[PDB]
Every structure is written in structure tokens, then in C-alpha cells.
């Protein structure tokens with residue numbers, strides 16, 4: 048019942064004892080494995096998760112079964128008996144946010160999990176204070192290009208009340224507009240959110256990197272359109288160290304990866320608005336965002352500019368073009384002094400995280416398909432590491448869009 | 451409902467209704483997925499046999515016919531009398547093609563219908579086994595115009611040992627464990643190399659020494675057979691524009707021929723059934739030559755390329771690996787040996803998936819194995835959700851016979 052986990056580059060074996068704690072079920076069954084799928088599908092309820100989280104917390108601080116332990120238990124009981132929900136102590140909030148990141152199986156950057164700035168926004172009312180909470184977050188996390196991990200936790204879900212929601216999937220998004228020639232100008236990923244902005248007031252630009260407004264939702268109100276100050280949104284124009292024409296392509300990306308549409312769950316509590324940010328790995332921008340066929344899809348453009356032989360796959364023009372786009376990314380972020388990490392350094396750090404986590408708690412939930420980079424997969428050590436994927440709590444989950 | 455499967459490049463949705471027919475269970479549970487792990491009797495045989503027979507008569511559009519009814523009765527009776535049965539010749543050809551069609555980790559399955567099946571079920575010795583393998587190698591190589599083939603040796607039966615090919619492939623380079631602790635040659639082949647020496651083989655000292663075969667007739671120790679050099683087509687590796695690349699002395703062989711998997715058809719088990727197709731360049735260029743535990747040439751090549759190998763952010767590893775794949779493809783094309791690059795191979799597999807959705811309503815596929823080891827998201831299969839499950843007929847891993 049303890050999975051044997053091998054690394055094939057080295058031969059080392061470990062055993063994942065932690066997978067036995069898997070609180071929730073994943074998509075897989077003995078009959079078929081669905082690990083590749085992106086989205087893979089009363090008061091007595093809330094108590095058992097909430098109780099289980101508090102032991103987690105007090106065990107984490109080497110003070111379990113203690114007087115302070117037993118007092119928080121009867122606190123949350125009576126809180127839930129008197130309100131139907133309960134409130135986290137701020138330190139429990141900090142712990143639960145770090146753990147939820149630590150528990151994310153698809154995040155290659157969890158070497159950084161113990162270093163996360165948590166901003167408590169649980170006292171937030173209305174969308175304007177949302178916007179102010181978000182702008183501080185952005186300015187702290189951006190830090191003039193010396194990026195720092197942060198999360199801002201808005202009021203938890205509670206009965207009878209609506210919900211705090213950020214309609215945008217990220218804090219910084221480029222618009223995608225449809226033409227009558229059928230294509231998209233800008234980021235195809237953001238077509239739907241883009242028209243929602245136009246339909247909620249926004250007047251549309253017409254560039255390929257038009258930063259979107261924020262559609263912020265306070266409980267039981269329609270979302271409100273907010274514009275981010277350009278001086279707030281740090282961007283990196285892309286150039287290549289030796290291909291002088293690359294700059295002319297006009298490519299650019301933003302500094303801050305800030306995911307704003309996932310639900311944060313701690314101890315049976317649910318925070319549908321808790322945006323979190325780190326820094327980018329280069330492949331996210333220069334491979335997926337720019338070269339996915341359903342994203343900016345620039346790979347052929349670049350290949351033409353390199354005078355590559357695009358009429359035969361076996362010249363590997365796609366591979367050569369992709370490598371240079373990633374080199375462009377890394378060189379550009381370093382030139383602008385914006386924190387970036389290349390896929391080799393990142394995956395070597397994740398391996399260190401695996402080792403640390405094997406000692407800390409007997410394993411690490413890891414989703415091989417998302418951990419292995421989208422270029423040079425087998426050139427990184429995570430390709431040769433067997434992984435075990437399971438769901439622990441506290442956690443980040445996807446959720447339905449608000450509309 | 452069955453698993454809903456999305457292609458993210460196109461937006462399209464399919465439902466893998468075929469997975470509901472999966473028999474032998476895989477290693478995942480609702481509590482934990484292990485899709486990334488490399489290695490994770492009368493009435494039993496009848497249900498296996500009858501389902502296979504049904505698959506056979508379905509394929510030839512004669513399901514429920516008289517011949518179909520009678521063949522089931524015939525199989526049932528033989529199992530009753532003897533505890534086992536024999537495939538008809540046409541069932542063996544069809545079974546072998548279905549085992550390939552069912553292999554979730556094979557990206558070259560667009561070809562599954564084009565498979566030469568050599569029936570060696572009347573094989574009786576290791577010498578005859580060697581002759582069958584040489585004929586297979588000769589046919590499949592075809593002087594570089596590679597043809598997919600499988601040779602099926604006698605099935606397992608009670609009271610008699612198995613035929614086994616001890617080698618993992620028909621062509622494998624020696625891996626000599628060095629007195630340092632290093633390896634000269636292919637480190638993946640240290641074990642089989644040591645068993646060849648121990649069984650009489652006088653070893654070489656090169657990095658690309660072709661191993662002899664150890665062939666196991668039933669209830670015998672393995673016997674050693676040297677492949678005739680002229681039967682083993684090899685490609686010197688050179689680079690189209692990096693002329694020093696030739697001086698690295700690198701070579702690979704032409705024929706990928708897997709010899710240590712068990713072929714299972716209708717409950718019957720063939721422990722020796724070596725099969726071959728042609729290479730996808732990344733198998734050679736990326737895995738065999740650049741894996742750290744294989745030939746591990748990445749740093750040497752990059753150094754020779756005058757790349758800045760002291761910071762990872764130059765992406766010296768990616769650039770050298772690309773040129774090594776370029777060299778492989780260039781060198782096989784120059785030698786006129788069939789080979790397929792990872793873009794063409796993955797594009798053909800998308801066609802296969804679409805065909806199988808129409809033919810059977812699904813297709814078992816191992817995403818981690820189908821996505822190539824370089825340029826993953828540049829290929830279309832990266833953005834294709836897949837469902838992984840076991841159908842029969844199948845090629846299965848089996849314990850090493852020693």
C-alpha cells in the first residue's frame with residue numbers, strides 16, 4: 048500500500064508513505080488512469096476537516112495534544128455551533144496558505160513554499176477595497192522586478208451570503224479580440240474575459256498586448272470594472288542576445304505570474320478569492336504562452352526570421368525556433384532585472400524539494416505531466432523521477448467561473 | 451458517462467467509451483495516480499479466449515455467423531480436453547496486430563495494420579530460434595527500407611519451459627563495467643553484457659560493440675549466437691553542418707527490435723515474440739545519446755559547439771540536444787535507413803487516435819510516453835488528453851529469465 052518510487056537516472060528508491068493521507072479522491076481507477084486530464088471531472092461535515100486541520104497545525108508546531116491544542120478545538124466547535132462557520136487564527140491562515148502551496152501537485156516551484164507573504168484581506172468589504180488590496184499585493188510582489196511570493200486572502204465563503212470572486216484568471220492578462228477574418232489579435236486564451244470587460248464597460252484597445260481591466264466581484268453585487276495603473280504592471284519587452292531582429296517582433300510579457308481564480312480551502316473553509324503570485328519559469332512564457340498553437344503561436348514567425356527550413360519537419364526548425372524564443376525570454380528578464388528561473392534550474396530545485404519532502408513527511412504529491420517542462424523534458428532530472436499524485440488539504444482547487 | 455477527453459489545441463471533445471472494456475487492472479486508484487511508474491486455469495482462459503475469438507470475427511465483419519459460432523465451440527472443446535488451445539494461423543496474425551494496436555506507450559501505431567507476422571510456433575531448438583531471428587532481422591532491415599515484423603515462437607504450455615530471448619532487443623551495444631566503476635559502451639546493457647561474457651562471449655573494448663544473442667530453448671540454459679556483422683545495419687552519425695561531429699565516432703543501429711516482452715493473445719502466452727519497426731529520432735538522439743545514465747554526450751557536444759556550459763540559462767543543453775537529433779536524422783537519411791522525426795511521428799498518432807475513435811470509440815494511450823522527450827508541447831499530442839488502460843491482446847513486461 049506504500050508506492051515504490053524510483054529514479055531511473057540514479058537508481059534510488061523511496062516509498063511514498065504520505066499518499067495514505069490523501070483526503071479526497073482523484074480521477075483515476077484501477078480500470079483507467081486519467082492523470083493527463085487538466086480538469087479531471089452540514090455542520091458535521093465542516094467539523095471533521097476543521098478538526099483535522101488543527102491537529103495538522105499543532106503537530107506542525109510541535110505542540111500537539113497541548114492545552115492550546117484542546118482549546119482551539121472547543122473554540123471552533125462553539126463558533127460553528129453559534130455561527131455555522133468558524134474563523135481562522137491569522138497564524139493558522141499563514142500556515143494553511145503555505146501548506147496549500149506545498150500540497151499543489153502541479154507546481155514545480157515548491158522549493159519556495161516556506162517563504163510566502165500572506166496578506167489578510169478577510170475584513171474586506173466591497174470591490175473598491177478589493178482593488179486596493181490587489182494593487183498593494185501587486186506592488187509588493189513586483190518589488191521593482193525583485194519578485195516576492197505573496198497571497199491575499201479575501202473573506203471566506205459562508206452561508207446566505209454571496210461570494211468574493213475575481214473574474215479574471217490572472218491579475219495581468221493580455222486582451223484577445225476576434226476579427227471578422229475569424230482569428231484572434233492578442234491572447235486567444237483571454238477572448239471570453241476580454242469581451243466580458245467590453246460588455247461591463249471597458250472600451251477595447253486593439254494591440255497584441257493590451258493589459259486587461261479587472262472585473263472584481265463583491266458578494267451579491269455585479270462585478271465592477273477597474274483599470275490597473277500602467278506604472279503598476281511591470282512588463283518586459285523581448286529581445287534576443289544575438290538575433291537583432293527579434294526585438295522588432297514587438298513581443299513582450301509581464302513580470303508577475305499572479306493566479307486569481309482558484310479556490311483556497313483550509314480546514315474545511317473555502318476562500319474563492321485568494322490570488323497568489325510567484326515568479327515565472329521561462330518555459331511558461333517562451334514555450335507555452337508564445338508557442339502553443341492556441342496561444343500567441345509565434346513559432347513559425349520566429350522560424351521564418353531565422354531563415355530556417357520550415358517545409359520539412361526533420362530539419363527541426365520548430366525546436367530551433369523554440370529554443371531561441373526561450374533564450375530571448377531569459378535574456379530579456381535578466382536584462383530588465385525581473386526575477387526569472389530557467390527550466391533546468393527550476394527542475395533541479397524541485398528534485399531538492401522532493402528529497403527534503405521525503406524526509407519532512409514521507410513523500411510529496413507530484414503530477415509528472417505538469418512537473419516535466421514543455422521543452423527538453425528528458426534533459427531535466429524530473430523526467431527520470433517517478434512521482435505519485437494525490438490530493439492533500441489545505442489545497443488550491445479550480446472552481447466554476449462566476450458567470 | 452465515460453471519460454470525457456479534450457484536445458486543447460483545437461477545443462474538441464471526445465468520450466473514450468472503449469476504456470469501459472478494460473480488463474486487467476492498472477496501478478491507479480481514486481486515492482493516488484501512478485501513471486508515471488515505469489513498471490507498476492480453465493474458465494479464466496475461456497473468457498479470455500472467447501473475447502478474443504469475438505474480436506477476430508468482428509474484424510472480418512462476420513460476427514455471429516456460423517463460422518464464428520463453430521470456432522467458439524471448437525475452442526471450448528479443446529480447452530475442455532487439454533486445458534489449452536491453439537490459435538488458427540489467421541488468429542495469430544490478427545492477435546499480433548491487435549497487441550500492437552493496444553500498446554498505450556507506442557506512438558507509432560498508425561502503422562499497426564502493416565505488420566509482417568512470422569509464425570515460428572513449430573520451433574524446436576535454440577539453433578532454429580537463431581535462424582528465425584536472422585530471417586526476421588534480414589526481412590525487417592531490408593537494406594535500410596525498414597519493414598515492421600514480429601516472429602512468434604511457441605506459446606507457453608504446462609510441463610515444458612519457455613522459449614526466451616534473454617536480450618532486451620535483438621541489437622544492443624555492449625556495456626562494459628569498468629574497473630573504475632564507470633561504463634564503456636551502453637550502461638543500459640551492463641547486465642546482459644556480463645551474462646554474455648559469462649556464457650562464453652569474448653568481449654570487445656569499443657563503445658559500440660554489438661552483443662551476441664542468448665537464446666533459451668525450453669528447459670535449457672541459454673545458448674550464445676553471434677549475429678553476422680552483415681546482418682546488423684548501423685549508421686555512422688555525422689552532422690550536416692558540424693563537421694567535427696563525425697570525429698566523435700558515434701553510431702547507432704538501424705533496427706529497433708524488442709525481444710523480451712510477452713505477447714498475450716486470447717489467454718495464451720507467447721514469452722518469446724520479438725518485434726520491430728523503425729526508429730523515432732528522439733529515441734536515439736535524445737534518450738540513448740543524452741540520458742545521463744546512457745551515452746551522456748550532451749556536455750561534450752555543447753563544449754565542442756563552443757556553448758557557455760557554465761550557466762543553465764544559456765540553454766546550452768537544449769541547443770546541443772537539438773543538434774544531436776539533427777545529426778541523427780541527417781545521418782539516417784544519408785544512409786537511406788528509415789527513420790521518423792518526433793513531429794511527423796506525433797502528427798501521425800493524432801491521425802491514429804482519430805481513426806480509433808471512429809473504429810472503436812477510444813484508444814489506450816500513455817501520455818507521458820507518447821509525448822516526445824524534447825520539444826514536448828511543440829507536438830500536437832502534448833495538448834491531447836489521453837486515457838490509459840489495458841486491453842488484450844497485449845504486449846506485457848515479464849520477469850527476466852535469470
Ligand code: HEM
Pocket residue numbers: 144148151153154155156157159163196197198323324325326327328331388393417443
Ligand atoms: C515562486 C516561483 C514559482 C514558480 C517558478 C512556479 C512554477 C509553476 C509552474 C510552471 C506551474 C505550472 C503552471 C502551468 O503550467 O500553467 C505551477 C503551478 C501551480 N503553482 Fe507554482 N510556481 C511558483 C510559485 C507559486 C506560488 C507562490 C503558489 C501559491 C502560493 C503556487 C501555486 C501553484 C498552483 C496551485 C499550481 C497549479 C495550478 C494549475 O493547475 O495550473 N505557485 N507553478
Ligand code: HEM
Pocket residue numbers: 546550553555556557558559561565598599600725726727728729730733790795819845
Ligand atoms: C513502425 C514504426 C514504430 C515506431 C515509430 C514506434 C515507436 C515507438 C516509441 C518511440 C516507443 C517508446 C519506447 C521507449 O521510449 O521505450 C514505442 C513503444 C512501444 N512500441 Fe512502438 N514503434 C513502431 C513499431 C512497433 C511495432 C511493429 C510494435 C509491435 C508489433 C511496437 C510496439 C511497441 C510497444 C509494445 C511499446 C511499449 C513498450 C513499453 O511499454 O516499454 N512498435 N514505440
Ligand SMILES: CCN(C)CCc1cc(F)c(F)c(OCc2cc(C)cc(N)n2)c1
Pocket residue numbers: 156304305306309323324325326327328331335336
Ligand atoms: C499553459 C497552461 N497554463 C497557462 C494554464 C494556466 C494556469 C492555470 C492555473 F490554475 C495556474 F495556477 C497557473 O499558474 C501559473 C503560475 C503561477 C504561479 C504562482 C507561478 C508561476 N511560475 N506560474 C497557470
Ligand SMILES: CCN(C)CCc1cc(F)c(F)c(OCc2cc(C)cc(N)n2)c1
Pocket residue numbers: 558706707708725726727728729730733737738
Ligand atoms: C529510453 C528507455 N527506453 C528506450 C527503454 C528501452 C525500451 C523498452 C521497451 F519496453 C520498448 F518497447 C522499447 O521499444 C522502443 C521501440 C520499439 C519499436 C518496435 C519501435 C521503435 N521505434 N521503438 C524500448
Ligand SMILES: C[C@H](O)[C@H](O)[C@H]1CNc2nc(N)[nH]c(=O)c2N1
Pocket residue numbers: 082083084085416417418458832833834835836
Ligand atoms: C492534456 C495535457 O494534460 C495538458 O496539455 C497538460 C500537460 N502538461 C502541462 N504541464 C504544464 N506545466 N502546464 C500545462 O498546462 C500542461 N498541460
Ligand SMILES: C[C@H](O)[C@H](O)[C@H]1CNc2nc(N)[nH]c(=O)c2N1
Pocket residue numbers: 055430431432433434485486487488818819820821
Ligand atoms: C519516470 C518516468 O515515468 C519515465 O522516465 C518515463 C517517462 N516517459 C517516457 N516516455 C517514453 N516514450 N520513454 C520513456 O522511457 C519514458 N520514461
Ligand SMILES: [Ca+2]
Pocket residue numbers: 227228
Ligand atoms: Ca465575413
Ligand SMILES: [Ca+2]
Pocket residue numbers: 536
Ligand atoms: Ca488442433
Ligand SMILES: [Cl-]
Pocket residue numbers: 304331336
Ligand atoms: Cl502564465
Ligand SMILES: [Cl-]
Pocket residue numbers: 706733738
Ligand atoms: Cl532503443
Ligand SMILES: [Gd]
Pocket residue numbers: none
Ligand atoms: Gd533576411
Ligand SMILES: [Gd]
Pocket residue numbers: 691692693
Ligand atoms: Gd561547419
Ligand SMILES: [Zn+2]
Pocket residue numbers: 075079080081082478479482483484485
Ligand atoms: Zn492515474
